[model samples]
Target: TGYLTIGGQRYQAEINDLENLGEMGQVWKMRFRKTGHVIAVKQMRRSGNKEENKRILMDLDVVLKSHDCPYIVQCFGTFITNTDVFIAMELMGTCAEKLKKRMQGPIPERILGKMTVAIVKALYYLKEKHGVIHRDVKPSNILLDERGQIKLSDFGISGCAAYMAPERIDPPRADVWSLGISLVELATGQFPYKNCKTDFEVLTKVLQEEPPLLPGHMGFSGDFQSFVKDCLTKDHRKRPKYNKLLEHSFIKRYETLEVDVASWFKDVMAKTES
Candidate 1:
């Protein structure tokens, strides 16, 4: 069977334009011509590295098993073309990293709080139900739908050296640290390592210095601030688990707030320059 039949829906890629250039793959928007349904296809060349292969399998397993959780992104299926493997997933209009630009500045505390709740819920599901760990938690991997739905995306290899936890660290603990690091950059318009020029500097500072803080004038919510502090406790033995964090004031406070992420995405920034 050819490309269209591989997805069981006769889907074909929009080859004229690429949506994202990922480290291990290219992302293109594909559609089922018959149904007019769209999807994001992550296509990667077959790899020689055992670790890379393992990571891709991990992603497949996680995505396939976790779709019931609203916060986690959904993967439809995987298919192989002569030289590349493609993972087809639900198409998200925009991600937090790109959406932030339109925020004009810091995201509102309430909106930020709601986003955190979504990620925590997803993380909790992965941990409690499957005992799996995300290894990476960051803005680029956070997604939102047109109706304000938020989701956690990407289960491939973790890339942010700065958020990398210790080698023997428990997966859950490492994730906690990663989440703490993610929130800082998501809320503030700066990298967790502000002045670092190299990956080495980023890693060194992340591991040795105090975790990034919400600057003084930002007046971030106390619960939110402490929630991150708890995540980045740093003492290998003390970081709180995702489940516990979900029950904290920062998250529970917004348990009922409704967000219009689609509108926010549309209103926050200008159209991309093609």
Candidate 2:
């Protein structure tokens, strides 16, 4: 009696793989019955609560409006059933979340540099084109494909407490802080607060201590170190916005470099054998 309209064409979907449990819901790997195109579907539970509805709308707004951006995950279609909200998007091979977990060592700066450029451009596009601030910027939300393309996903109203900025100084600035923390995780191959004994300890450390930085012993370049420093500034007021960060030397260094992201991803995924 019904069909999903993806890219303005009607079709049915066949669920294949349950990729991962997203923060909001389960993500299903799906195939278009007629076109045979594989896509990822984010399944979210519908609710009557006001705040919940707001979050759903916010998520829909960003994904629905962002059609032209390559770095932001492209949405093919969306539909609502009696109880769930299903969003169809381009299927990515994996995410930084799995990469950090499977790899035994830190990510190469060459690759991380490339990822930073992609992610920053996505965030900047969201701000400028959609007037939306991605509340969450974490390893798991950054998706990668076999083709070496990086995309920002799950731009909803969810975020990790560990990545919170000093304060709610500004929406855009807070996002800058979250990106800094995510980069640190990718560079170190572990959570910044992994050593913290408990959740409370983590919160206290984030609130009382200086913002986390790339370890000096890691041998990351000065431009990389400085770029992160600017993002992690304790004073939210002092933090540079996305436009300024784009002009930083670190982004410039790798923005156009032909880093082999696909090769690096293949080796990392092969190591885990997943």
Candidate 3:
């Protein structure tokens, strides 16, 4: 079936004007004719084998099953056309790459810390509850929502058997490594191994070489440095568990820092209190 219409909703216009979002597969931003809502649709272009398609579909199912998390991308639905398989999801605010490019330089440390917390919480939930391993975790896969909330997206290349743990690299520890790299990116506006020209070189560095000390490293608190060190440990066995990480001194600092939302709530409580 070529472009099968579901629920009487047919594609009125084949609007191919969408900006290409980077991914292994072809990704496009499309506007629905009926709802006028914009969404992102990713289709497998080079998944020639049935095994590849099946794996991608299974990964999409896992992503869709993830529920009620503010940090996970909202998956709308999926369909199969004659020529391609489509996975539709809510459009993210902007790719972290674009944001970094537009900004003058690295984001402020406080903002980076907040973003790290959000990503870490999302990973914690996924690992502890869902038992899904996201093999590929990078800044390009992390997105920001309209409200400035950091959301983790793209599970296409996830769940590699080698990346999962109790054996080698467990989901929690693998994600922690990625989280640490993301923090380095947020603080430096550069990938962990920007100098590596090839995928082989990048992977070699990630698997063998220790992550270089981040710029302005002196400014980070002792607890923060310890947290990063623990996360980036080459020996996966030595990495801290996700639950334990929640109680790390770096995280505790944020927990102790209170936000004064009372001023905004004062108006609502004025009559009741008086």
Candidate 4:
């Protein structure tokens, strides 16, 4: 509702944007009057309140600064003098973060188990077939469709820092650590470093402690707990490989189990309406 304008052109700011929101900056699902089309407009300040947001606009610059910055920026009534170049550039769509926030709790174990199997398969395929390592495997990078199908994204360098392992020397092992953390977040609705106020602290925790696991009281299945143990093994060398992981009891068991994504999607939507 707090739409605004620049260069005499108008834009509509979406109050519900999940990823781009901060106390200082926001991403709006924009309706550009001049173009009569819809697009995502991300506005970020160089200095966030924490004063350490180096990565905020880093991805934008890397993306737009790569000769693709001419989209909505030019449409916002292109403004530049002959002397200096000025640049200003650019989802009711499924959002994993917003979807979870609306649910007001950790996801159900059945759905959570489905998410885990999907991630493992994806990471497994990336390594086995494509030889690509998904260096980032966090909750936000994990996307959900209207049918609740999960899509892992963000291959770009600008990624969530806490998920990074100390070494690229062991990408698969590092991936396991990241997945372990992701699983805990789905189970508990909190990052492993929730008590930490800084990225340094989070990294330190990752280095010092074993990777996170679902709390003991949860009584997660033996296969689930064993799978997490294998992932969080700090030795990296001891961490399970994809083929070995594919045969893990958890994967073997849930690989074909059908998940009722429609009911779960409606559950979240109902929560939002209520």
For each candidate, give its TM-score against the true structure. Answer: 0.81, 0.85, 0.71, 0.63
> Candidate 2: which stretches are off by over 4 Å?
1-24, 45-54, 82-84, 169-172
Most TM-score-accurate candidate: 2
Best by lDDT: 2
Question: CA lDDT, every prediction?
Answer: 0.71, 0.78, 0.62, 0.58
- Each candidate: how many clashes? 1, 0, 0, 0
> How many steric overlaps does candidate 2 have?
0
Across 176-249, the per-residue lDDT of candidate 2 in tens digits comes to 88889889888988778778866567667777887789999999999999988998997888989888999999
For candidate 1, lDDT tens digit of each residue in 1-274?
A: 2233333454444333233433324667776454555778776667546677677767777888996887888876666667777777788767777666655446666767878888889988988898878878777888876667778988875267767764323333677777777777778865578778887777777667786767667888888899878877777577777767878988888787666666765555345421
Candidate 4 segments whose C-alpha is farther than 4 A from its true place: 1-93, 166-172
Better of 3 and 4 by lDDT: 3
Clashing pairs in 3: none
* Sort order, TM-score high to low: 2, 1, 3, 4
Candidate 4 local Cα displacement, residue 181, angstroms: 0.3
lDDT of 3 by residue, 134-182 (tens): 7667666677655455678877665422212222432347777777776
Which is superior by TM-score, 2 or 4?
2
lDDT of prediction 2: 0.78
Judge candidate 2 at residue 167 and give its lDDT.
76
List of clashing residue pairs for candidate 2: none
